[PDB]
Symmetry: D2
Subunit: 454 residues, 4 copies
């Protein structure tokens, strides 16, 4: 058995929502009322201790309008022959599946109007098809649906867990321990989890991620999160980086710590983001962008990428290079990897002349694929012509020639990436941070901020 | 007026504790009962709503032993021009202090025995000296101490705020907003704050940090946290890095993301629960170590440093280099910076021979200062001879020659730091990570784990 | 429809109890737990707010023994023209009862075992006969039984009221007002009432009185209380006298205030705690005893009768007298009244000789009917030979000659019944009251106390 | 020590009340809020658990007007030298009584305004005189007044009990037991008791009775209730009669059960809700009226008396009679008893003519003392000329001649008091009950009803 989707037609703030499901569902977002009402909708469907009180006047969409509450759950009855849960579900629902080739099962919840005697009268029905459902029989206080499912609710037979906000008064090491227990152990086969803590998502895999949007109207996006076998050795940094970005509205994907130093200085001088959200800065280095981009795109989070046009030399060869920075953006657009170029160079001196020759090659590569660069710019993908250091020289190069006594200030900062960046940031003023922010090669910061003039 | 220290001579789980204070005090740690009882001790000293109920039997260290509760607060009254709160404390407390030469002031709490009549009878006294205190006069239900101080308690006249766990059911952007309001606005002049969330400490300055140790016996370490004017341009990254490290037991200070990739691969193969038991990896890049080390040392957190012997060339000068990797560790040991050396290198080729000459000079430098290196190993400071890549080649170099078709994998892995390290991690087995973990040049990982063979 | 009886086959202190019912049921007694659980048994039968929680482990007679709870209510459904409630019960319960020849109708409750899964699972069934009951159909949270009956519970569709202890913090005039509203108004057609206050019973008629016995085992006696049209002009005195006697264990029925004054003096000298242990003195004068005796006998209260052999003259006729004192006891034994006698007395003097002739006639009538006197003594009926004053002279006559200067104290004490008896009580000692108490003509006091020597 | 009075000068419904006190105080009445606030005023004076919360805004007289709450208690410090409670009070109040001849002690409560800081600040002071009170010294949370007194509050050192409504869910035999314990045992030396049940007053003596009047404005009447040694043998009957009359507004004092039969039939035909509005019929026989009348007069209950002009013969002498009916009313007005009169009557036949001669003597006696009869009529005292059956014959005598076959229906009613009055009441209509009610010899019933319709 595998939960597929739940449709809630009328509830406290749900109107016609459909949320795709899996086993191991996780819900998060700004709307705490929507997450609480999602868990209470599950409790009304599958827990008798909540269902026995019926529906009140307050638990309709408007308080006297659209008096038909429907909650329907899809179950995917077709499975393997050897699993116990499918057969133990089928053995209770006898007259349900009229055909033995039935693949989909439905558990429905109907409600009467609240005007009659100030009561709701929840009525439950199964059936293997949406039309022609039949009633769930029960002799007394107990339904036949209660014989199959058990619901355990946590707040500080087939078993479904509902964990609400377990990080309250909890140290972060115990949150990481609970994350490992939730997503690795076989005890929690079916659960629904709501949280605000990114430390509960450091170990996460084969889970359905549900994001509830910031609006008062409940909007839900669902993504089926898997980590494939290629990223198994870099899974921990990937999950630790992405878990804090899941709680953001706007995420800028950058390479390393020196870009974070520069962008945090520029943002602290321009907009300290006490008025704004203050979206996330995400460090992505050594991998491709497709995993983060599909995860954030299916969840409704806007993704901004600034990258450099790198030329990676091949291993064990001479004079051949890969178009890695172009290939990552082409993989983002869904294209295939380009062929490798061959660069023939004399020896001469190999210190400083080779970087100039490679920079000229990067310039003419940037000239060749300008249409693909415009297609990257159609999305929020920003590919530098050579490197971000050259863009910084094109923005604030007079200040860089003032601070650094060398005739060129680029190579002095390339020769020590982290240490010289702090020296430039220390001697950096308010005027030229705005010069960086207003430049046309730093529009990624403008998209990350997302400012409105008024 | 500035709070200096509070001494609690007998209370429900305190024995003889003495905690130094400031304005803007922050308390954190594993022992939640100790933090709650610290806030209750402050409420018993300064809040009449807690004093009017008196002391029970349970408000004692052992439930009958050493029945004399003393809570004494030191104030350091006399300033000349600093504030108006000193004068409004003088004008009410005219009795014991008359001369302006008295600089130190005391507010003392005493309790009677609970053996007979089942009551505590909290008695309060002021006085400018520890001997010869005099009673606080009060005509009815109200003391004269209540005219000076006001206490506001938050849980989800001179004014003192007591905020207990404000991050409960709170999104992390609002935690950052509350941190900025707590440590930048002038509304919260005096407060005591307890928290589990690192997002409430992204903006912190001029504050007293109190750490409560993991033991059942209450041990408190207090540090006066300031950020000086040199680190003002890198303050936000530094605070964001240090706030998560404040909630750990063992912290390893590393340089950048390549070290993090390699070390989390090695740790995930060897001990995948290092974050559960209190380990943390801290990226420190572009600054000196002393600001992190003094903060972690005064709070009782063990600090481990893994660094490389770098040569830093100056700006505008040719042939002179800085012994910066030695200089950071010498600054950690409280010593002055070494003088700059001169290296004479001919024209030749600048690519590969220059690196070999610099590595040879680093080997001679490492041989010259071996006594200082042994003193660095006396503390938890680990300085490599050349680089981490050479130590990795000394550990798993046959594996690196197997993965990489180049005969020298050190140069190939140093051409692209981030992408080639992910490639090495991808084709890495369980046998290689134990070879890295058991090597003598990677004892920092053993100190971070904390396991001792003998 | 008229409530007939309820049988509770297993409940938290009921074993096989069977209580006859009517409309307007009143329950009282020492066992407060039994009254509370009687009202809870009614709530478990007829209220969905109590049924929806089911049965616990504590809702059983012994906590594991005889796990089959049955609560069955009989209704005597079929009338021809009496009310409209019968037709509105037929119209919903069309299934089991179709013919109009079925006069008796049943509402049955059954419960499952609480051994496994910790639930009771109350199951309800109707049917016009005890065998072959059928289930009550209900589509959702609501039964078809809930459509007919409504239950309103008071504690400081056919409607049943359940009033529990309404006299709490209530002035006694409002208790009499609630009594008049409960037993005269047509709003409370069906109710069950529990009380400790006799002021709630000053207006009672056409009601079923249920007494719960003082034992821990629940014993219930039911009496159908009516006041006939003969006692309609003295109804308020019978109700006010009997309401306080309903809360007693032993009741002595006396004539007037002289007997009460003498017996309260004697009891205050001998056993001053007769009211604490359950004794009561009831004044009955001018009526027959049968209305009190049948009510007290059906409720399990022991009744003791002390009376005098009076001769009652008729109106308008001379020389004919009625044997009223014999006739009341003969009516108590279910026998017809004796025929009138004729006494021939000459003119003579009418003051003192006439009383002696009447006393001699009373002595010879007492000699004639000694077998009937012995049968009265078989029950708790005590008939004096002439008068109580002669028995007092036969007990303490020397004391009466000492107090009163007249040689015959019987005539003097009979000239003024109230003022001379107070004079005899005033000059009375402890020795005289024990002489009255131990005399053979005052065994009614020994039966009222209840102490038996052997 | 003995409590004398408590003055409450501003409280939540008290304005300037003075209530005289003794030991063993009992408070009752319609105003439940006034009794509850009287007990709260005692708790605010003498209980630290109520003083430590202070005064709110609501517990002032109006919600802002006359913000000066004063509660003062008087104690009678003069006592015998062997008394312990006086000595243990004096040993704590050291500087209180400036003279050793001080007889009166004061315990005073004062309050501050609640306009600022929203606090009451209860301040307590002793002193042996109303001017020049001094503060109660207390070092911490505890006053010196708390060392002397202990307060125990009951709701379903010198020790004061406060029992509020103990008859709730209590059987009446336990109420009589608690009454005997409260008023006979020496455990409850000091108490204040509030009740609604007359069964808690069956044993009562040496107590202060406080009645709270039916108005919303708190009016309190206090009476010192004692039973003298003359009524010690009729004490139980007297207390059982008076306890139910203490909860009434208008009380008619009648002789025996025949008058109760007649008057309660007449009231059931005329004013069926006489007891609902505060009427009560009290049987007084064989005693004088003064003990009931002084108790009801000091408590503010209106007393109505209907009595007959009886002639009682004297022991041991022939022909002398007492004017008992005149003497009881003269004792009510505070006059001495009249001398006995002598009637010389020959032997003749003493059946019927003797009663006629005695009735003629009663008529001329009624003619002699007509001025005293008018003075009795000035109060609510009604004395018949001969007897009540003669007034009944003067009212409805035609009906009595219709029912009774005798030409003289008075003597047929006199020869059997109880059975013939029931026979008259049985054959009694609505018309002649209004004839009894409207007659000028039955104005006591009109005063008993007493409805000011206008």
């Amino acid at each position: 058995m595998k939960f597929s989707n739940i449709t809630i037609k009328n509830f406290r703030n749900f109107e016609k929502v459909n949320i795709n499901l899996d086993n191991k569902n996780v819900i998060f977002g700004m709307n705490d009322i929507g997450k609480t009402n999602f868990l209470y909708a599950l409790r009304f469907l599958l827990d008798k201790e909540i269902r026995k009180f019926g529906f009140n006047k307050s638990d309709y969409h408007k308080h006297d309008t659209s008096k038909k509450i429907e909650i329907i759950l899809t179950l995917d009855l077709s499975n393997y022959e050897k699993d116990e849960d499918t057969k133990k579900l089928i053995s209770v629902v006898k007259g349900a599946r009229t055909s033995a080739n039935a693949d989909v099962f439905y558990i429905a919840l109907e409600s009467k109007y609240d005007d009659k005697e100030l009561y709701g009268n929840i009525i439950l029905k199964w059936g293997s098809e949406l039309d022609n459902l039949i009633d769930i029989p029960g002799r007394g206080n107990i339904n036949a649906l209660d014989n199959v499912f058990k619901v355990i609710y946590i707040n500080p037979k087939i078993v479904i867990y509902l964990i609400e906000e377990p990080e309250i008064s909890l140290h972060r090491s115990m949150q990481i321990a609970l994350s490992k227990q939730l997503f690795e152990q076989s005890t929690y086969k079916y659960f629904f989890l709501s949280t605000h803590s990114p430390e509960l998502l450091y170990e996460m895999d084969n889970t359905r991620l549900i994001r509830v949007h910031s609006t008062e109207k409940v909007v839900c996006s669902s993504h089926m999160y898997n980590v494939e076998e290629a990223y198994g050795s870099v899974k921990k940094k990937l999950n630790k980086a992405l878990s804090s970005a899941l709680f953001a509205e706007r995420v800028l994907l950058i390479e390393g710590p020196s870009e974070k130093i520069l962008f945090e200085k520029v943002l602290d001088e321009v907009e300290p983001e006490y008025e704004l959200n203050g979206g996330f800065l995400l460090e992505v280095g050594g991998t491709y962008f497709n995993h983060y981009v599909c995860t954030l795109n299916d969840l409704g989070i806007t993704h901004i990428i600034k990258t450099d046009n790198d030329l990676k030399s091949k291993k064990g060869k001479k004079g051949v290079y890969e178009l890695l920075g172009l290939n990552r953006c082409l993989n983002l657009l869904g294209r295939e990897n380009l062929d490798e170029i061959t660069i023939d160079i004399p020896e001469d001196i190999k210190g400083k002349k080779k970087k100039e020759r490679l920079n000229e090659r990067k310039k003419e590569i940037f000239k060749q694929y300008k249409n693909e660069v415009g297609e990257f710019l159609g999305e929020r993908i920003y590919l530098s012509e050579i490197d971000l250091e050259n863009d910084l020289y094109s923005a604030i190069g007079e200040s860089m020639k003032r601070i650094f006594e060398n005739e060129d200030p680029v190579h002095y900062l390339q020769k020590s990436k982290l240490f010289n960046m702090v020296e430039l940031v220390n001697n950096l003023s308010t005027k030229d941070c705005f010069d960086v922010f207003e430049h046309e090669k730093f529009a990624c910061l403008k998209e990350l901020v997302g400012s409105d003039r008024g």
